[PDB]
Amino acid sequence: PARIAIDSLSALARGVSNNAFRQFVIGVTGYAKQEEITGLFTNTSDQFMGAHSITDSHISTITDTIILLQYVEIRGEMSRAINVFKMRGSWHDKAIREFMISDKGPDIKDSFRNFERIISGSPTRITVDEKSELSRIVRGVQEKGPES
Amino acid sequence: KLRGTSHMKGEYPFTITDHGINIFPLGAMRLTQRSSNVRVSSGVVRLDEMCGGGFFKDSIILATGATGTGKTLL
Amino acid sequence: EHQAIAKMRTMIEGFDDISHGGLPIGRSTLVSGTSGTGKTLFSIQFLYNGIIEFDEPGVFVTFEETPQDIIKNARSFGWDLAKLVDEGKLFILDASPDPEGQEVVGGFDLSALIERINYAIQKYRARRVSIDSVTSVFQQYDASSVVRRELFRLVARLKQIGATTVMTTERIEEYGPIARYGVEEFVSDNVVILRNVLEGERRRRTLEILKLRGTSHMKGEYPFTITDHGINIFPLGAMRLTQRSSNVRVSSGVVRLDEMCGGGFFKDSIILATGATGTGKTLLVSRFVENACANKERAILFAYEESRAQLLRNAYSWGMDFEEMERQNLLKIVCAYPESAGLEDHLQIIKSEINDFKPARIAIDSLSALARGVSNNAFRQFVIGVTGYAKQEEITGLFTNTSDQFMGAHSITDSHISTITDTIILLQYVEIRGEMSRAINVFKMRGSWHDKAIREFMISDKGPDIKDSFRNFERIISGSPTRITVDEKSELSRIVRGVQEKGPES
Amino acid sequence: RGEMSRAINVFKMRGSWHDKAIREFMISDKGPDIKDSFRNFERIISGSPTRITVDEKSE
Ligand SMILES: Nc1ncnc2c1ncn2[C@@H]1O[C@H](COP(=O)(O)OP(=O)(O)OP(=O)(O)O)[C@@H](O)[C@H]1O
Ligand SMILES: Nc1ncnc2c1ncn2[C@@H]1O[C@H](COP(=O)(O)OP(=O)(O)OP(=O)(O)O)[C@@H](O)[C@H]1O
Ligand SMILES: Nc1ncnc2c1ncn2[C@@H]1O[C@H](COP(=O)(O)OP(=O)(O)OP(=O)(O)O)[C@@H](O)[C@H]1O
Numbered sequence A: 001p002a003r004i005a006i007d008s009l010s011a012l013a014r015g016v017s018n019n020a021f022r023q024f025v026i027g028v029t030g031y032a033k034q035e036e037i038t039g040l041f042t043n044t045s046d047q048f049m050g051a052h053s054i055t056d057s058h059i060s061t062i063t064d065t066i067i068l069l070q071y072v073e074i075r076g077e078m079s080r081a082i083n084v085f086k087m088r089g090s091w092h093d094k095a096i097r098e099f100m101i102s103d104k105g106p107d108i109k110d111s112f113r114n115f116e117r118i119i120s121g122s123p124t125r126i127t128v129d130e131k132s133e134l135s136r137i138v139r140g141v142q143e144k145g146p147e148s
Numbered sequence B: 001k002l003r004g005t006s007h008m009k010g011e012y013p014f015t016i017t018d019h020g021i022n023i024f025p026l027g028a029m030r031l032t033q034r035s036s037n038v039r040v041s042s043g044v045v046r047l048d049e050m051c052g053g054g055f056f057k058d059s060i061i062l063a064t065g066a067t068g069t070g071k072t073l074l
Numbered sequence C: 001e002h003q004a005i006a007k008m009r010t011m012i013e014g015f016d017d018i019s020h021g022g023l024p025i026g027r028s029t030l031v032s033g034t035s036g037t038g039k040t041l042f043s044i045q046f047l048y049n050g051i052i053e054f055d056e057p058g059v060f061v062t063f064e065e066t067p068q069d070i071i072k073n074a075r076s077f078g079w080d081l082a083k084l085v086d087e088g089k090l091f092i093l094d095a096s097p098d099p100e101g102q103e104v105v106g107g108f109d110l111s112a113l114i115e116r117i118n119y120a121i122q123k124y125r126a127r128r129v130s131i132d133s134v135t136s137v138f139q140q141y142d143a144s145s146v147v148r149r150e151l152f153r154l155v156a157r158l159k160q161i162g163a164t165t166v167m168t169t170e171r172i173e174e175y176g177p178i179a180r181y182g183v184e185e186f187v188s189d190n191v192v193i194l195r196n197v198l199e200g201e202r203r204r205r206t207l208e209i210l211k212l213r214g215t216s217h218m219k220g221e222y223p224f225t226i227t228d229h230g231i232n233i234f235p236l237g238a239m240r241l242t243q244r245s246s247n248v249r250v251s252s253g254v255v256r257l258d259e260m261c262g263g264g265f266f267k268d269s270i271i272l273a274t275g276a277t278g279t280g281k282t283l284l285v286s287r288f289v290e291n292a293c294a295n296k297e298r299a300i301l302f303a304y305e306e307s308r309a310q311l312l313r314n315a316y317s318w319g320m321d322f323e324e325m326e327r328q329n330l331l332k333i334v335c336a337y338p339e340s341a342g343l344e345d346h347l348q349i350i351k352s353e354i355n356d357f358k359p360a361r362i363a364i365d366s367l368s369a370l371a372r373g374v375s376n377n378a379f380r381q382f383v384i385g386v387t388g389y390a391k392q393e394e395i396t397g398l399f400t401n402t403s404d405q406f407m408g409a410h411s412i413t414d415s416h417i418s419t420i421t422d423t424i425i426l427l428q429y430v431e432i433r434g435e436m437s438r439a440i441n442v443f444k445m446r447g448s449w450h451d452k453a454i455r456e457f458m459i460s461d462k463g464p465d466i467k468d469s470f471r472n473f474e475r476i477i478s479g480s481p482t483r484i485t486v487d488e489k490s491e492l493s494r495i496v497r498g499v500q501e502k503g504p505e506s
Numbered sequence D: 001r002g003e004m005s006r007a008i009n010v011f012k013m014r015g016s017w018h019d020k021a022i023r024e025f026m027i028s029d030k031g032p033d034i035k036d037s038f039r040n041f042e043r044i045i046s047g048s049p050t051r052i053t054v055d056e057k058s059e
């Protein structure tokens, strides 16, 4: 193969000890690496929303690029977000983009610019006067320019 | 032990297959993997953009998220 | 030296510190351990170093190995015993049995042996004696009391003769009785235990001086390694807190940082960079290593997370050409999986390479990676070891730590190395407007003033650009702050309308 | 509001599309009645919401 994907390293960690597991990861990881095979590995975090570490098993240092998916509760609704957490040789986007899933597949929309605490799964929506300043009613300093 | 010379120490896992004993010296693998600047697509264009032009051919990519978030889609 | 007992140096690396001078002269030291622990090697090294450094002839008594084998095997460490046997400095006295023999002979032989060994000692004018595996001799058909008497007889005659002896013994359990018959322990003047402990599929060798009638010594277990140079022991608790301390500064390879650190790092200092995965600890390391080359100084980058190739691709993408540093013979890259060894080994490889390359700067990318698996106490011990070596050697050291949780990390380190370190550089993700920005912070610095700001910074091909602090924010460390505004729009250059040019002209 | 209400959510479904709303629901003798989402609330998931009651754009 040119590419390899393992759907759920996190399912292989079931039972086994962390040290035996880490050993397995380095195993399939370095084999792929020395073989010029691009590999995409999957990890299901044990808790939805609020996850404080990329991986529970602490593999995220043994990896080059990290793609992170997370639920964001927006208005009584469960939406997704995707973020290129890190990429070793490149620049990658720093946005936590919202994204939907359809028959067409994944559509990556925009970031939740007007929110705080997104990482947490339950943001705090927050415009309460958007970036045009409490001077939307622009004072009336402009009461001169126009005349008769 | 091997009186007179050196050797790797410790336990090493192995499997008995149709080709007999197969041992993996997981601690004998060297940190000499080749590294290029060549890119490759994710299967998602917008993703590719976010990653500055695609995943590196020489790379380990990890997709994490809660159950149902769509790792399996990616 | 205030010790009541005259000792003889073994010249085995680290042993004389542990034993507060070497083996008591005129007495015998039991050295016991399981199979493959290094007994035979210790006793050989004892005679060998004795001949090559003090011109003290030696008598080696072998009950199982063959004189050819003892000579063949010593070549592993580059020792030519054959030459010394030749010059009459070393005499191997073959006491092994015959592949063709009978049955019965372990006590008048114990007299035949005494009389024999006295001949050899007398003839070669020997001062050191090693008896290899006395155990195997009564392993003919004996019970505890018979062993205690025979041993005692031998040790005793040897003391009369005036010889300093090393007697080797076997044990079956790593932590059980000291030696087989549970009797040798008390019959010898000094006891040394060689252990080769399992624990998690890795093996760790330790040496312990359990007793030395008459003098003091270091207590407990000490990790050691058998190399091409024989036994090598690290008395990590024998390391003194007398490292030289200067006020001299050095660059980090990042100017803005240097400012932040009130004029760059101290030459004499241990620096720590921690932050979640992806924050850029590796970038800073790269830039700290490169800086010692641009100043024509030698530096070593010990990498435990990235290949030498990858390290290079990535480095080049950040400017800095690692290729050149290599050729110019200013930069040396190591690289190794933490699993490809035990901490002891690792520690020695690092020391080793610092001696062959005499760096002025050293960088360990990810101590936190070396902590994978190992127990915290074994890890802390490793850190004090590499840290302290560097310190007493005037070598500036930059160590990396990846924190297990991005954002919201409540302690600088999960392993609590935070007191062992002089300067702490802290990297973190800040969620600002649906986006992950980074922030850098000089958390502490021992002899300087350093900036207290948590500056935001970007990473480009040019490398790290350190911008400004997030003044109008609260809950920064939390990782996802709250923006509050007494201002923001306040000056800095308001004067609206047409303030820019575009690409054409300006 | 000082009361313990319920909510239901189709957290995930592998082949389908399912609704992503966290819908309030009651239980009677008739069984389960699924009403509407808590659109004007924050931290629902946490169990202890905060209704937004935004002073709109406030003109
Ligand atoms: N045809 C579809 N149309 C819209 N959404 C879909 C469709 N199929 C699946 N989905 C959505 O995508 C999710 C499936 O996730 P996916 O199979 O990608 O793997 P995962 O989340 O990484 O891991 P796991 O399924 O084990 O939890 C569902 O929970 C659902 O919300
Ligand atoms: N050059 C070398 N480099 C590293 N290790 C070596 C080298 N030569 C030998 N060794 C190691 O040292 C060990 C030698 O043990 P040694 O012969 O000293 O006696 P022993 O283990 O105490 O007793 P026994 O006679 O039961 O084997 C070998 O097991 C091997 O692992
Ligand atoms: N050329 C580049 N241009 C812009 N950003 C880059 C470039 N190269 C790397 N980066 C950024 O720097 C990050 C790499 O982190 P770095 O190699 O410094 O080590 P780390 O964060 O300390 O440790 P680790 O990589 O093991 O997690 C990437 O995730 C990315 O955001």
Ligand SMILES: [Mg+2]
Pocket: A007, B072
């Ligand atoms: Mg799945």
Ligand SMILES: [Mg+2]
Pocket: C282, C305, C306, C365
């Ligand atoms: Mg790194």
